[PDB]
PDB file of N, CA and C in Angstrom:
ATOM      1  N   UNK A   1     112.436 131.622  22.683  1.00  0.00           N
ATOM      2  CA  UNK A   1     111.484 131.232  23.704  1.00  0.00           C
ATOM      3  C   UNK A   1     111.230 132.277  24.771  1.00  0.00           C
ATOM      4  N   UNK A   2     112.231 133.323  24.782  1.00  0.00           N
ATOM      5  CA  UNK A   2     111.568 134.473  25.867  1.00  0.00           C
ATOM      6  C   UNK A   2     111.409 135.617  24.833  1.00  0.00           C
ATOM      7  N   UNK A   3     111.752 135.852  23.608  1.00  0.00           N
ATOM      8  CA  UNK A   3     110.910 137.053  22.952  1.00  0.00           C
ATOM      9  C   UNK A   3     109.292 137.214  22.501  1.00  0.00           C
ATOM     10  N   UNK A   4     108.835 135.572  23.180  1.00  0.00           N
ATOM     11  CA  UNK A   4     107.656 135.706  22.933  1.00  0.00           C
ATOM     12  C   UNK A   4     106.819 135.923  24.212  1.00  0.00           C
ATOM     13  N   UNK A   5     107.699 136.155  25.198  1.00  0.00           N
ATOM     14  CA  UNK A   5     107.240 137.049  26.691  1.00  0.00           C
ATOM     15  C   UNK A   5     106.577 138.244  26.701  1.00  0.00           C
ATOM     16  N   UNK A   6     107.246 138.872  25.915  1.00  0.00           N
ATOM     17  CA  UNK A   6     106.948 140.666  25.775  1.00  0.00           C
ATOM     18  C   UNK A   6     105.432 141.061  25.177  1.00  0.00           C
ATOM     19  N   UNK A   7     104.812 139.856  24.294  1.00  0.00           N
ATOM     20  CA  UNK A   7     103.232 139.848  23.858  1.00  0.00           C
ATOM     21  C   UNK A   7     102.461 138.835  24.277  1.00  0.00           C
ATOM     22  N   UNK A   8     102.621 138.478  25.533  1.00  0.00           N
ATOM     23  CA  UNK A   8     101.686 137.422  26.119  1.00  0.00           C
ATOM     24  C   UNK A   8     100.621 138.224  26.678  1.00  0.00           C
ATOM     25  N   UNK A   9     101.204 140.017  26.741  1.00  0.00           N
ATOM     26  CA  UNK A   9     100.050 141.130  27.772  1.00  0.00           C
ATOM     27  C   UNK A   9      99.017 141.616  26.666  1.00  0.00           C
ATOM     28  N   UNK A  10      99.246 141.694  25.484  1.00  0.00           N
ATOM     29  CA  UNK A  10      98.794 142.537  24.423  1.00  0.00           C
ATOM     30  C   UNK A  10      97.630 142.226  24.223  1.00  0.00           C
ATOM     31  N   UNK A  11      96.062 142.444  23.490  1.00  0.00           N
ATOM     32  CA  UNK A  11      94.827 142.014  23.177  1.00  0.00           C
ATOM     33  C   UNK A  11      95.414 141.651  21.706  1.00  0.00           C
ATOM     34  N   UNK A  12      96.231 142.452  20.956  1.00  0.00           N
ATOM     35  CA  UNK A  12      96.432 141.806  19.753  1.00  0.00           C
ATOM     36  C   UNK A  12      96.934 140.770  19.435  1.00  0.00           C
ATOM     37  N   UNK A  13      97.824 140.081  20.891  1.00  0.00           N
ATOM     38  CA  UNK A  13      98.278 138.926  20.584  1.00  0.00           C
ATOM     39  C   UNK A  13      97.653 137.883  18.930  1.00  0.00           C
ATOM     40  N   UNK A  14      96.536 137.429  20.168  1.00  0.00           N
ATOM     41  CA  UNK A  14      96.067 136.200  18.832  1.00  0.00           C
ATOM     42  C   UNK A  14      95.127 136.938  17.310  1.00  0.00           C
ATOM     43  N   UNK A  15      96.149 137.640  16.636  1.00  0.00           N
ATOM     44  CA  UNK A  15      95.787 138.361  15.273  1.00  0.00           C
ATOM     45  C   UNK A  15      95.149 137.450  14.186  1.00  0.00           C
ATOM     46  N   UNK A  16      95.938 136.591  13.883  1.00  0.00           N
ATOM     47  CA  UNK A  16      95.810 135.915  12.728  1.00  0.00           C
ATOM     48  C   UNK A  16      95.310 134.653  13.091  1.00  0.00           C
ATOM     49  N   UNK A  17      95.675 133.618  13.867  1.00  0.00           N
ATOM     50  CA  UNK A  17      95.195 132.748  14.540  1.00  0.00           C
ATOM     51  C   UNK A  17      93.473 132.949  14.623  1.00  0.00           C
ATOM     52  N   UNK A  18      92.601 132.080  14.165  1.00  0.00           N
ATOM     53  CA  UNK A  18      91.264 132.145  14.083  1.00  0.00           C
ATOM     54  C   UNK A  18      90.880 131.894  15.402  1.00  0.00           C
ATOM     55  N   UNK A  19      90.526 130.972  16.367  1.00  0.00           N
ATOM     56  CA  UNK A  19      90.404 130.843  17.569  1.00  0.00           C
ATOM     57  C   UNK A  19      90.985 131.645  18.615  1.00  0.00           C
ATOM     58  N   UNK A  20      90.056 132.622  19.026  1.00  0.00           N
ATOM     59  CA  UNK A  20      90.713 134.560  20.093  1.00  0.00           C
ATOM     60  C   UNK A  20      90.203 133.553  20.938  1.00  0.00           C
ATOM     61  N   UNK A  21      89.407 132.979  21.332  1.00  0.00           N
ATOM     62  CA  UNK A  21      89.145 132.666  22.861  1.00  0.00           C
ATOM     63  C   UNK A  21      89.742 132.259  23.647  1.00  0.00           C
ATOM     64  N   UNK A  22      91.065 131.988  23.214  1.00  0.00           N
ATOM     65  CA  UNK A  22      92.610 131.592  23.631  1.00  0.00           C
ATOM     66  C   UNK A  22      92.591 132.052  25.437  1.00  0.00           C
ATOM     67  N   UNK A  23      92.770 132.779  25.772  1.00  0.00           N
ATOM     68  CA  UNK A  23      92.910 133.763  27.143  1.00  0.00           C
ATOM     69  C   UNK A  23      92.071 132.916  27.715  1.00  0.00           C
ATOM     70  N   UNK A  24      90.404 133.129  27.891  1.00  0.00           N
ATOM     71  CA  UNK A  24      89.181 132.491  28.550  1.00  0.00           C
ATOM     72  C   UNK A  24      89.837 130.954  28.453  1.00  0.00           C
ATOM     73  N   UNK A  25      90.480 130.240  27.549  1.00  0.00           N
ATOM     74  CA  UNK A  25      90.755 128.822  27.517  1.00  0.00           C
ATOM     75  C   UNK A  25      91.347 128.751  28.914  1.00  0.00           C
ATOM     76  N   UNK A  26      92.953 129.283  28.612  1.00  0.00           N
ATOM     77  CA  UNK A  26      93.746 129.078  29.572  1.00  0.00           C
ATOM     78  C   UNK A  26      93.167 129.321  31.055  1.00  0.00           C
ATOM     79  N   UNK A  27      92.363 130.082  31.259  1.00  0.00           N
ATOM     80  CA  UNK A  27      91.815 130.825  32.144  1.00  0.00           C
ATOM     81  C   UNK A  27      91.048 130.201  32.952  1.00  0.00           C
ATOM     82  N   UNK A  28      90.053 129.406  32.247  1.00  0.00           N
ATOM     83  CA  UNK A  28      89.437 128.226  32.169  1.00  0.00           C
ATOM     84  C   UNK A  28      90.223 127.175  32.802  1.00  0.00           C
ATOM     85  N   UNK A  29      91.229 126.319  32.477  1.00  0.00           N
ATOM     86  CA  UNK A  29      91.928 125.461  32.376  1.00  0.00           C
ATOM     87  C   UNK A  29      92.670 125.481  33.762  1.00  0.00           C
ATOM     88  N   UNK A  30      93.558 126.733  33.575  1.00  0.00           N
ATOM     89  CA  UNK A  30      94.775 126.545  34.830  1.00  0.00           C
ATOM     90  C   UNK A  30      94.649 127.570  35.978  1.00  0.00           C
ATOM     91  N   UNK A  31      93.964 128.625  35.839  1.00  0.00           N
ATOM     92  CA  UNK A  31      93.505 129.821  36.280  1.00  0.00           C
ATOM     93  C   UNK A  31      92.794 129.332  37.489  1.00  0.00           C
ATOM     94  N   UNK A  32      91.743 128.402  37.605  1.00  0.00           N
ATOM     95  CA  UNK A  32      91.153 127.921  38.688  1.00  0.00           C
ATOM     96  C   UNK A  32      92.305 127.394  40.117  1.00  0.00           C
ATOM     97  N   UNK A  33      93.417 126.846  40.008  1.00  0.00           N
ATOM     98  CA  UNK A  33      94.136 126.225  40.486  1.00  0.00           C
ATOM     99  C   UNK A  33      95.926 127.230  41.121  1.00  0.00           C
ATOM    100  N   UNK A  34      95.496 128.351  40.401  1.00  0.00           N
ATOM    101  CA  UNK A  34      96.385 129.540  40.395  1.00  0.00           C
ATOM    102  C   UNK A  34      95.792 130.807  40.778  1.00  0.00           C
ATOM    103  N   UNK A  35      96.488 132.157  40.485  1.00  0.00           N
ATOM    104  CA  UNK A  35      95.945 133.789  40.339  1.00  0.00           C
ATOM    105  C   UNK A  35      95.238 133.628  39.104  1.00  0.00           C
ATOM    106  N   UNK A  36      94.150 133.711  39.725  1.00  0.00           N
ATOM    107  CA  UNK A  36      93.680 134.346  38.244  1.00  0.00           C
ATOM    108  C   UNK A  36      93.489 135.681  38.158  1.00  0.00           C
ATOM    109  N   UNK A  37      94.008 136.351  39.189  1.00  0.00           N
ATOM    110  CA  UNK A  37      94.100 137.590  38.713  1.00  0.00           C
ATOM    111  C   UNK A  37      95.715 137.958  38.075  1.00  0.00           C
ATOM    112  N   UNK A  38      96.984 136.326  38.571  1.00  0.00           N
ATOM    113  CA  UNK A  38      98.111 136.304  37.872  1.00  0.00           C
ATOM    114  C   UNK A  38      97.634 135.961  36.605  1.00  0.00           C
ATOM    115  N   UNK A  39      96.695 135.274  36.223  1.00  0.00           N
ATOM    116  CA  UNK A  39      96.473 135.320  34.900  1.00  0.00           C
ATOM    117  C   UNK A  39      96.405 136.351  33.954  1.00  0.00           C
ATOM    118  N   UNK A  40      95.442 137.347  34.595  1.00  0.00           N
ATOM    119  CA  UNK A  40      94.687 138.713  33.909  1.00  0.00           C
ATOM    120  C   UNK A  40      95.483 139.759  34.547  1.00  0.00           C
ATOM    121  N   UNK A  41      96.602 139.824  34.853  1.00  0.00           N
ATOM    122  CA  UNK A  41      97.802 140.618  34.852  1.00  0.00           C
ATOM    123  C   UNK A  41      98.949 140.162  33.781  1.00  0.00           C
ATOM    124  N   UNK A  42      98.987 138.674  33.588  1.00  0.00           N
ATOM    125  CA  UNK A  42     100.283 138.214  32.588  1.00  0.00           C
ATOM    126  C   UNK A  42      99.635 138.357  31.406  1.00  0.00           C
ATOM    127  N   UNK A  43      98.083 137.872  31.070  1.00  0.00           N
ATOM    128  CA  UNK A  43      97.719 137.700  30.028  1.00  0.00           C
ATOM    129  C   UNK A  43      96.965 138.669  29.696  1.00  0.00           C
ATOM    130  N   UNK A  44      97.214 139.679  29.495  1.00  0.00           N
ATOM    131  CA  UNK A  44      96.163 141.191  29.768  1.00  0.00           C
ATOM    132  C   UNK A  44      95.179 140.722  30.571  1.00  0.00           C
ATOM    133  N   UNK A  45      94.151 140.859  29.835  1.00  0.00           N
ATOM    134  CA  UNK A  45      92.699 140.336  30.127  1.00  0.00           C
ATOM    135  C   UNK A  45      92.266 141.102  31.205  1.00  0.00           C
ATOM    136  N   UNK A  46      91.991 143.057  31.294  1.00  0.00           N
ATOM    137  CA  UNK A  46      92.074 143.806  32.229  1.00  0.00           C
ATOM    138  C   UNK A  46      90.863 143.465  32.773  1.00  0.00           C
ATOM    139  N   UNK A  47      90.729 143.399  33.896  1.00  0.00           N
ATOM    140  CA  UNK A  47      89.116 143.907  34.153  1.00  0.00           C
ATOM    141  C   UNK A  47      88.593 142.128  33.932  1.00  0.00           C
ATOM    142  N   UNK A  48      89.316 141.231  34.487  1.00  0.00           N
ATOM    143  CA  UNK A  48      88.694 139.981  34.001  1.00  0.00           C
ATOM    144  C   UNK A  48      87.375 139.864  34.966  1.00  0.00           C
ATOM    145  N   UNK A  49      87.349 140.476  35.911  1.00  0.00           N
ATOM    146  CA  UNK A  49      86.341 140.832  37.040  1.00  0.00           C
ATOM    147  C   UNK A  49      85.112 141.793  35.995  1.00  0.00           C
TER     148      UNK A  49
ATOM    149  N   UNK B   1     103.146 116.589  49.095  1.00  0.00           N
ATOM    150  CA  UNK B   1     102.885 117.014  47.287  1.00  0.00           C
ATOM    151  C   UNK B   1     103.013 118.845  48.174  1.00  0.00           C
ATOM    152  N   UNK B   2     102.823 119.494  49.223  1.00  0.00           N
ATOM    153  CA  UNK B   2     102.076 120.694  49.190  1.00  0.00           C
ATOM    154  C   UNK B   2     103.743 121.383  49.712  1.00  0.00           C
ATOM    155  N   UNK B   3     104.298 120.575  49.855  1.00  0.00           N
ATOM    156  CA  UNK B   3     105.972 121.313  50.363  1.00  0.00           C
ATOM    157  C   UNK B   3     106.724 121.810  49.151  1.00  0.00           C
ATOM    158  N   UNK B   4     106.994 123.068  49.847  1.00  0.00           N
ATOM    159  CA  UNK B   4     107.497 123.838  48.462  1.00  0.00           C
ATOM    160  C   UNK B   4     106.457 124.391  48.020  1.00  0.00           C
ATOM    161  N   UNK B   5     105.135 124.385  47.664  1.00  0.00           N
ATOM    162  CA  UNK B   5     103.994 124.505  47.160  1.00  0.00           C
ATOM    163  C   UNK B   5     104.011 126.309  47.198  1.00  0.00           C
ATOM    164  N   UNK B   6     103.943 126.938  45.777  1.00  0.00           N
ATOM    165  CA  UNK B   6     104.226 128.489  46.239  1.00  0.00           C
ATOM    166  C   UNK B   6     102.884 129.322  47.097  1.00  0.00           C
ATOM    167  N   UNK B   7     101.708 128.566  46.869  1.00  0.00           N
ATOM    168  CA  UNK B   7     100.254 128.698  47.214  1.00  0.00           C
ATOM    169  C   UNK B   7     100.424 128.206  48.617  1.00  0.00           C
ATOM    170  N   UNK B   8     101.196 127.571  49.090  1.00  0.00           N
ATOM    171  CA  UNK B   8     101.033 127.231  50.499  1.00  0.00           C
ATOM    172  C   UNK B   8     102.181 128.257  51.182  1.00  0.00           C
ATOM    173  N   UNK B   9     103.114 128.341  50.662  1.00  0.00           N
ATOM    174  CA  UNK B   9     103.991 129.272  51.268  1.00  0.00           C
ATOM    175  C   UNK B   9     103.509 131.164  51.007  1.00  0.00           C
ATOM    176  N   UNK B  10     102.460 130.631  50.299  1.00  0.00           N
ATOM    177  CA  UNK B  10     101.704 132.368  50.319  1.00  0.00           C
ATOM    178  C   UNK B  10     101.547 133.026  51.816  1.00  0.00           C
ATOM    179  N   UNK B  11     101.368 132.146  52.659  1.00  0.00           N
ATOM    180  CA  UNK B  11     100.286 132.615  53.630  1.00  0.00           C
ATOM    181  C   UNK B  11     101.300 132.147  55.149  1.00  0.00           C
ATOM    182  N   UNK B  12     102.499 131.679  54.466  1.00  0.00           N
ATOM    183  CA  UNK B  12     103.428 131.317  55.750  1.00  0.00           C
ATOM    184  C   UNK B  12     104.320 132.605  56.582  1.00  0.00           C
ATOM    185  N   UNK B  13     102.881 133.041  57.419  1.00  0.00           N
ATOM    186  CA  UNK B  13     102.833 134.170  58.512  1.00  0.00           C
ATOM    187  C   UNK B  13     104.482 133.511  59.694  1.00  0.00           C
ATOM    188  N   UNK B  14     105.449 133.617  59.639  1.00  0.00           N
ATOM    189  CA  UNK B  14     106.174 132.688  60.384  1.00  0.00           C
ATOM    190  C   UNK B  14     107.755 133.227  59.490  1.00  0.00           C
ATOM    191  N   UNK B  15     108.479 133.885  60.117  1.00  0.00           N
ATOM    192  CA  UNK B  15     110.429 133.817  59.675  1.00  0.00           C
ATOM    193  C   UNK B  15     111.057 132.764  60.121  1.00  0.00           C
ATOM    194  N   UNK B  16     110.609 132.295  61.547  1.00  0.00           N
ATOM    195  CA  UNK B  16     111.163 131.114  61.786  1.00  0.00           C
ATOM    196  C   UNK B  16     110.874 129.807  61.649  1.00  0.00           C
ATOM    197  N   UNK B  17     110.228 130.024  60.153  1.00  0.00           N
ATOM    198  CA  UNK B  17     109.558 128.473  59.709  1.00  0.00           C
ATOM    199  C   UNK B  17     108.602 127.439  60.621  1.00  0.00           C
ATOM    200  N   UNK B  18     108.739 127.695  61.748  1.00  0.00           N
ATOM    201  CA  UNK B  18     107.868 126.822  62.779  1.00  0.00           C
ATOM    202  C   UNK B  18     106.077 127.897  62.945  1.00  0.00           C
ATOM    203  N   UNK B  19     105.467 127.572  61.687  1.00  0.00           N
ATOM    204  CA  UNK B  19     104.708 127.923  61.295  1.00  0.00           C
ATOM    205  C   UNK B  19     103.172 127.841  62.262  1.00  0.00           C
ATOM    206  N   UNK B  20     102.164 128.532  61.940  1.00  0.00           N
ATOM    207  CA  UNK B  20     101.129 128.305  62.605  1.00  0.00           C
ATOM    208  C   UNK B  20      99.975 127.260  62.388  1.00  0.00           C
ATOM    209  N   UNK B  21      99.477 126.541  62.588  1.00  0.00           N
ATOM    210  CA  UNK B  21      98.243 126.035  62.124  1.00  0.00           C
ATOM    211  C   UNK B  21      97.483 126.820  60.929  1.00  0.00           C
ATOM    212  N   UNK B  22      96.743 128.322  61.457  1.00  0.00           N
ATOM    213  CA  UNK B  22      96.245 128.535  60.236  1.00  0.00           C
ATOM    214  C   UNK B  22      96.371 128.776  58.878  1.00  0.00           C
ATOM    215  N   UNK B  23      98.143 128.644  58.760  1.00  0.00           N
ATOM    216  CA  UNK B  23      98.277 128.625  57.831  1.00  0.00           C
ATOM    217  C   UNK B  23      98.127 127.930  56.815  1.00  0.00           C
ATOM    218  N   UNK B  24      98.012 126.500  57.455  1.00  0.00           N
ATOM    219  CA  UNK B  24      97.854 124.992  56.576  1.00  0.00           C
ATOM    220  C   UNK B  24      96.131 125.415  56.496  1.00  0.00           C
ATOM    221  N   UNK B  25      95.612 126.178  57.145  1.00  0.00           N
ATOM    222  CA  UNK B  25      94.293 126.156  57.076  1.00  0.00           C
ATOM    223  C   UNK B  25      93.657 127.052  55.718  1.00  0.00           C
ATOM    224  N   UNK B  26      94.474 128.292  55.842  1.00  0.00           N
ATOM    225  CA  UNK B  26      94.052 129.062  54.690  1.00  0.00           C
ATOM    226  C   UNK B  26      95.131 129.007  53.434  1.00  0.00           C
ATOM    227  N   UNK B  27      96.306 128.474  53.642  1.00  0.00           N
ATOM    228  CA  UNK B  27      97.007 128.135  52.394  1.00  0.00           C
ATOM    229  C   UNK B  27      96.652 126.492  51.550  1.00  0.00           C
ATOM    230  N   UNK B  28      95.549 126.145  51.784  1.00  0.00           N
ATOM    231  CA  UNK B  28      95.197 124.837  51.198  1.00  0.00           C
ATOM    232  C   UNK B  28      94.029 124.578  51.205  1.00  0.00           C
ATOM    233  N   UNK B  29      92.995 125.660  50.873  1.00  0.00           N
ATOM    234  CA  UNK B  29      91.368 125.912  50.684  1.00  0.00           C
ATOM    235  C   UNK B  29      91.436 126.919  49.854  1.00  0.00           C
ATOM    236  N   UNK B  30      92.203 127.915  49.705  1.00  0.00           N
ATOM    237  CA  UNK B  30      92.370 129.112  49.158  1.00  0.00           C
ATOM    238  C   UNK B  30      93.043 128.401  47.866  1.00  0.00           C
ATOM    239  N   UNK B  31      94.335 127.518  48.088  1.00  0.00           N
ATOM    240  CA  UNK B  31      94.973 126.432  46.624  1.00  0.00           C
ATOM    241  C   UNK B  31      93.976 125.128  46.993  1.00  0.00           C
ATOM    242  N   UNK B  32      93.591 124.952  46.151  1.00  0.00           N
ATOM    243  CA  UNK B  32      92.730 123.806  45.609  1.00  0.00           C
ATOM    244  C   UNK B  32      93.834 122.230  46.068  1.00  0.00           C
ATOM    245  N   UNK B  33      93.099 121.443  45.520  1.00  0.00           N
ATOM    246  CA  UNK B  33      94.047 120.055  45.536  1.00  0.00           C
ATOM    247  C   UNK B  33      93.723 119.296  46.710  1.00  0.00           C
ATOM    248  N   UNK B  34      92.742 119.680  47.602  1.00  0.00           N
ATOM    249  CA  UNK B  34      92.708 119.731  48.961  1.00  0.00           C
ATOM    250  C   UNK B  34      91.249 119.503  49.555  1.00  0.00           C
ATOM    251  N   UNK B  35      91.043 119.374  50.521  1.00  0.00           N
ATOM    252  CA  UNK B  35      89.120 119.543  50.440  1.00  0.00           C
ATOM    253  C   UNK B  35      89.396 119.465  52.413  1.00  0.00           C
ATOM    254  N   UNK B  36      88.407 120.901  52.701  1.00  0.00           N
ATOM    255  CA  UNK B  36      88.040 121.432  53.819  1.00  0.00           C
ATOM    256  C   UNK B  36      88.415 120.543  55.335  1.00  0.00           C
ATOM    257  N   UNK B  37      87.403 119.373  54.685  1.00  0.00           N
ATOM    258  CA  UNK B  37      87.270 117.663  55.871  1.00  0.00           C
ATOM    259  C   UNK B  37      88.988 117.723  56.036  1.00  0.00           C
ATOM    260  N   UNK B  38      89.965 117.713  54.783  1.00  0.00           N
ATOM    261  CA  UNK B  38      91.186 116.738  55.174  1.00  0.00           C
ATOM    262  C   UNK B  38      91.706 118.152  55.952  1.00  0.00           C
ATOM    263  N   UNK B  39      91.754 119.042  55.752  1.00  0.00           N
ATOM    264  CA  UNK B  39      92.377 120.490  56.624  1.00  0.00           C
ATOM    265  C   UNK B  39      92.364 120.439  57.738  1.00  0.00           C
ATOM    266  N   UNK B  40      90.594 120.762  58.444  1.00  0.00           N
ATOM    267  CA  UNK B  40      90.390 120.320  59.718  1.00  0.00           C
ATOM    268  C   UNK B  40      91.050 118.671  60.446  1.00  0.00           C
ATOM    269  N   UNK B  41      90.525 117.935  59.978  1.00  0.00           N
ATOM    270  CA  UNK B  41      91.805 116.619  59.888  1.00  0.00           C
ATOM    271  C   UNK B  41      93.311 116.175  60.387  1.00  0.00           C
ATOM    272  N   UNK B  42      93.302 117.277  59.508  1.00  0.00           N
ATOM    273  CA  UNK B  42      95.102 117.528  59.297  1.00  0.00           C
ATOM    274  C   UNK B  42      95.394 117.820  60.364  1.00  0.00           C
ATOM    275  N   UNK B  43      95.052 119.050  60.911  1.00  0.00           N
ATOM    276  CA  UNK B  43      95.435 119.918  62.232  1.00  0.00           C
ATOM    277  C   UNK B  43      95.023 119.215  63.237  1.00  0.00           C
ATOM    278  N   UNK B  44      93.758 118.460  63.543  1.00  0.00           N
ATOM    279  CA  UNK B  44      93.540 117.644  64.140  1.00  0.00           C
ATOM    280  C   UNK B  44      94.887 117.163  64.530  1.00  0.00           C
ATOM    281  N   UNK B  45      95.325 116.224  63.652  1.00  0.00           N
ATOM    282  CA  UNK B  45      96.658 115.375  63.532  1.00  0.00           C
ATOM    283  C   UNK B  45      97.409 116.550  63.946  1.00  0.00           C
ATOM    284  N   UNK B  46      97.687 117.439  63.335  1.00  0.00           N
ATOM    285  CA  UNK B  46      98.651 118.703  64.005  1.00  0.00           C
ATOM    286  C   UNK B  46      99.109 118.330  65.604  1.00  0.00           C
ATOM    287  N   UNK B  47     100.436 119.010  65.467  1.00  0.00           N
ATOM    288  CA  UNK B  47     100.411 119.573  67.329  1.00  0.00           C
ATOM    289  C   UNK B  47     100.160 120.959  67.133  1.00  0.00           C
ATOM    290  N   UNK B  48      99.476 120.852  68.345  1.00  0.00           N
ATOM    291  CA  UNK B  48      98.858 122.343  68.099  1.00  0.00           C
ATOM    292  C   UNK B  48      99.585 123.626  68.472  1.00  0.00           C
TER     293      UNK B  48
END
């Protein structure tokens, strides 16, 4: 449960998984109510601006 | 609900915990959950 810490930053994360819009979801979702620039620092997503 | 709140303790300008007004002002418009009317309100109720 924490070796999957180390690729939460990566763009390759969601490879195989058909649905990439994963990031914008969360982002979407919990991001409003938080950083969303803690978002687009934990979850790559450079430049979410 | 906002004690403890890490979004409210963002902005807690204060070491000796006896905090300022604006802080309840801009740590709870800036975190959501909250709406402008109850802020002003609040402090109202505040001692100032």
């Amino acid at each position: 449960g924490q070796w999957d810490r180390l690729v939460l930053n990566t763009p390759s994360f969601p490879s195989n998984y058909w649905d990439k819009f994963v990031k914008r979801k969360v982002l979407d979702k919990h991001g409003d109510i938080f950083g969303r620039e803690r978002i687009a620092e934990l979850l790559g997503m450079d430049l979410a601006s | 609900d906002i004690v403890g709140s890490e979004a409210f303790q963002d902005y807690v300008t204060d070491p000796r915990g006896l905090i300022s007004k604006k802080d309840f002002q801009k740590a709870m418009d800036s975190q959501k959950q909250f709406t402008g009317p109850e802020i002003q309100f609040l402090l109202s109720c505040s001692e100032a």
